[PDB]
Design a protein around this ligand. Structure first.
Ligand SMILES: O=C(O)CCC(=O)C(=O)O
Ligand SMILES: O=C(O)CCC(=O)C(=O)O
Ligand SMILES: CC(C)C[C@H](N)C(=O)O
Ligand SMILES: CC(C)C[C@H](N)C(=O)O
Ligand SMILES: [Co+2]
Ligand SMILES: [Co+2]
Ligand code: NA
Lengths: 262, 264
């Protein structure tokens, strides 16, 4: 499981690459059933929307549901991630952002790396985000939007907002881009939203500027994201580290697994 | 009969409930309309609706009564030719609004049909009207375009009662008549979501019973959407109570005469 040379160049130049149809419909069935089961588990890893009606984000489902553990070790994910980072990898973060039909809320414009750098002592952006679509992603159900190529700017420096939106994780709003920055950046780094059927995979750079809008549609948008990190790039927090459900601590190199998810 | 829709365009309107005419107005004409909009946004009065956060204008009514170029627009054969063709009658302005959905958080518009609001609020007898959208901004997937449930006007009016309380006392916000999640879930299989997208100066005609709505605009680009509702002169509202203000519901049923030529 490998990227084509064009796909590697696309990731380098644009900051994201889309692999359609990586997981088959029956594997999507098994994953969605495990998502529905996992959403019922109470705990601090389960983040509700502000309006309280539905789950907004779930952390560390791979520690509770076997299929998500299998997914996280799949060579269909680790092959591409290893090709891009050229190192041994471990799971820095595992989340599913479950954006409900009929009002699932937005995700603020941000970069990921600065959050992990400043909150957790992540030294360098030697990591890759690997999205797995558990819903068809369309123009209508709040797809991730990227500022194309904006990871080439590196980290856009800022201080965290005075008050945190959530005490269960860092909501990107805490490190949100300002309007002035977005207006300047979008002219050089235009908006693009990769669209594809469920089971598709989207790899994207931790310094790409990205965000997503509220989902007004009748269709849910369940988006799984695994952040793989270089084992030699473990966080060095100055204080007590955040919980393991949000920030991984086991830097044992992952060994990939071939075959279907079951 | 100058500005005539083709058979294909009429068929699209009849079957799908909307049709997009790209590039109807030039960049120069769009610029004049955008300058008029910036001026009109500053006019104080009840025709000016603010977003819930008060930070920007959400909607303006009756700009054609204050800005010459919007009066010219409302009489242009590029809008009245198609409207007259679709309705086959003399027309007057039922409603004139500009929904100015600002960059960086301009708010959504609830899923709804237009006709039932006018039927129940104003005594509009029948859906013998057409909505004419004019794009004063480029409309993309990113700046909260109108989304239609394609073909849903063929269901006629989906009956409901207005919400006990109104969101606004300056106009009827569509949320007062919003579609239920159950309705939308059931209907979208047969009437899928579609969003006309096009450069500023394009025109979008749509039926007053099509289900439609729009999302918040998280992008750095504004989305200024002008909508003129033309009504059959024989289909004037017959209100049972005191009529709403003229800035929101037109009363002068004198047939409009279309004009050719550039806006200035
Ligand atoms: O789920 C989304 O739309 C994006 C959220 C995101 O960027 C993140 O959680 O880092
Ligand atoms: O501006 C929009 O997105 C649509 C609002 C609408 O449908 C209306 O005002 O009737
Ligand atoms: C910007 C996001 C990737 C941050 C994430 N929610 C965290 O708490 O680590
Ligand atoms: C549904 C909308 C077309 C109603 C409009 N805002 C009015 O007050 O008439
Ligand atoms: Co992010
Ligand atoms: Co409407
Ligand atoms: Na004209």
């Amino acid at each position: 499981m490998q990227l084509t040379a064009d796909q590697v160049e696309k990731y380098k130049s644009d900051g994201y690459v889309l692999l359609e149809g990586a997981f088959s419909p029956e594997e999507v069935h098994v994953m969605r059933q495990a998502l529905k089961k996992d959403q019922e588990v109470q705990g601090p890893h389960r983040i509700l929307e502000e309006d309280g009606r539905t789950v907004r984000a779930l952390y560390a489902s791979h520690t509770r549901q076997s299929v998500f553990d299998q997914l996280s070790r799949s060579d269909r994910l680790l092959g591409p991630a290893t090709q891009l980072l050229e190192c041994d990898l471990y799971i820095h973060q595992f989340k599913i952002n479950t954006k409900r039909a009929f009002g699932g809320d937005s995700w603020a414009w941000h970069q990921d790396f600065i959050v992990w750098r400043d909150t957790d002592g992540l030294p360098a952006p030697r990591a890759v985000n690997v999205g797995v679509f558990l819903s068809d992603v369309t123009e209508f159900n709040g797809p991730v939007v990227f500022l194309s190529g904006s990871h080439q700017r590196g980290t856009v420096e800022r201080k965290a907002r005075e008050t945190s939106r959530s005490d269960q994780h860092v909501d990107p709003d805490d490190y949100s881009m300002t309007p002035a920055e977005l207006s300047q950046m979008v002219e050089k780094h235009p908006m693009v939203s990769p669209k594809a059927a469920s089971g598709s995979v989207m790899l994207f750079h931790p310094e790409i500027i990205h965000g997503s809008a509220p989902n007004i549609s009748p269709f849910a948008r369940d988006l799984l994201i695994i952040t793989y990190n270089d084992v030699a790039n473990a966080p060095k927090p100055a204080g007590e580290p955040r919980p393991e459900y949000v920030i991984g601590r086991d830097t044992t190199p992952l060994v990939s697994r071939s075959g279907p998810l079951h």
